[PDB]
Amino acid sequence: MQDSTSDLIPAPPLSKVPLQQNFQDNQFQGKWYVVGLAGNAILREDKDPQKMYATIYELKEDKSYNVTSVLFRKKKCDYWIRTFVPGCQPGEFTLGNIKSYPGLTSYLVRVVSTNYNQHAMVFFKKVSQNREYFKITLYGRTKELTSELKENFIRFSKSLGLPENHIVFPVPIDQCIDG
Numbered sequence: 001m002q003d004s005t006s007d008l009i010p011a012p013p014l015s016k017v018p019l020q021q022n023f024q025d026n027q028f029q030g031k032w033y034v035v036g037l038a039g040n041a042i043l044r045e046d047k048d049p050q051k052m053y054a055t056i057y058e059l060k061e062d063k064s065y066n067v068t069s070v071l072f073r074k075k076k077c078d079y080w081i082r083t084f085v086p087g088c089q090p091g092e093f094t095l096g097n098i099k100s101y102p103g104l105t106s107y108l109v110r111v112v113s114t115n116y117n118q119h120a121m122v123f124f125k126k127v128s129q130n131r132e133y134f135k136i137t138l139y140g141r142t143k144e145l146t147s148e149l150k151e152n153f154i155r156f157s158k159s160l161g162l163p164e165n166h167i168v169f170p171v172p173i174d175q176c177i178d179g
Contacts, residue, residue, distance in 0.1 A: 009162050012160045012161060012162065013160070015160055016112075016156060016157060016159075016160030016161055017112065017123065017160075018112050018113050019091050019110050019111070019112055019113070019123075020090075020091055020110075020111045020112070020113060020114055021091075022090055022091070023090060023091075023114065024090065025059035025063065025065065025086065025090065026059060028057060028059065028114075029056075029057045029058045029059040029065065030056065030057055030116065030141050031054060031055075031056035031057075031070075031141070032054065032055060032056075032057075032120060032139035032140060032141045033052070033054055033139050033140035033141075033145075033175060034052045034053050034054060034055065034137060034139045034171055035052065035119065035137075035138045035139045035140050035145065035149065035153070035169065035171050036137060036138040036139075036153045036157075036168070036169030036171050037050060037135065037137050037168070037169065037170060037171060038135065038136050038137075038157055038161065038165075038166065038167030038168060038169075039124070039133060039134050039135030039136060039165070039166060039167070040133060040134060040164070040165045040166070041131070041132075041133025041134070041135070041166075042133075042135055042165070042166040042167075043166060044166040044168045044170050049170045049172075050170050050171070051072060051172070051174065052171035052172060052173075052174065053069060053070055053071045053072065053176075054069070054070040054077075054139075054175075054176060055067055055068065055069040055070065055139070056068040056069075056070070057084070063085065063086050064083060064084070064085040064086075065083060065084035065085060065093065066081055066083050067081060067082050067083065067084050068080070068081045069081070069082065070176060072174065072176050072179065075179060076179075077176035077179065082095060082096070083095065083096065084109055087108065091110060091111075092108065092109075092110050093108070093109040093110070094107050094108055094109065095107035095109060095126065098126075102129070103128055103129040104126075104128060104129075105126075105127035105128055105129055105130070105131075106125075106126060106127040107125075107126035107127075108125050108126065109122070109123075109124055109125075110123050110125075111123070112136075114141070116141045116142070117141075117142055118140070118142060118145050118146060118149070119138055119139065119140055119141075119145050119149055120138070120139060120141060121136065121137070121138050122135075122136060122137045122138075122139075123136050124136065124137065136157075136161075136167070138153050138169070150169065153169050154168070154169060
């Protein structure tokens with residue numbers, strides 16, 4: 001080292017960090033296909049790639065979401081649920097009961113921009129008693145998306161988020177409706 005190196009990129013603006021308008025819970029609740037995964041505390045290893053899964057957002061008549069994440073087995077798909085609830089208004093939600101929770105310190109969720117006919121992007125941020133990690137995902141609320149969406153998800157995140165940490169889309173297809 002000790003020579004010209006790669007520190008060219010300037011401070012990345014929020015341009016990769018927009019937020020959904022006043023979209024409503026009562027119609028937003030649905031089932032997306034997990035299509036990319038990036039965060040500072042996320043483990044993307046070439047040796048051990050992450051299989052993609054699915055998650056369904058189901059609102060309840062009490063400004064709250066019960067979210068079902070679907071996973072793949074060798075020939076079965078199973079369900080597990082986490083809850084999400086809007087903070088004070090639409091656009092901001094939290095997970096669990098971090099106010100009442102012991103080792104959960106601060107869980108805030110804010111989807112960036114959805115395109116429910118193609119794709120949507122999530123900004124997930126949370127802390128445990130003393131751990132700080134955040135994750136951003138892109139998934140497909142439709143049966144199919146675009147083949148450009150692969151390069152486009154990398155190039156958009158790359159231009160704004162460069163290769164800072166574990167920010168990639170190690171998510172193949174393998175939709176569980178085909179199994």
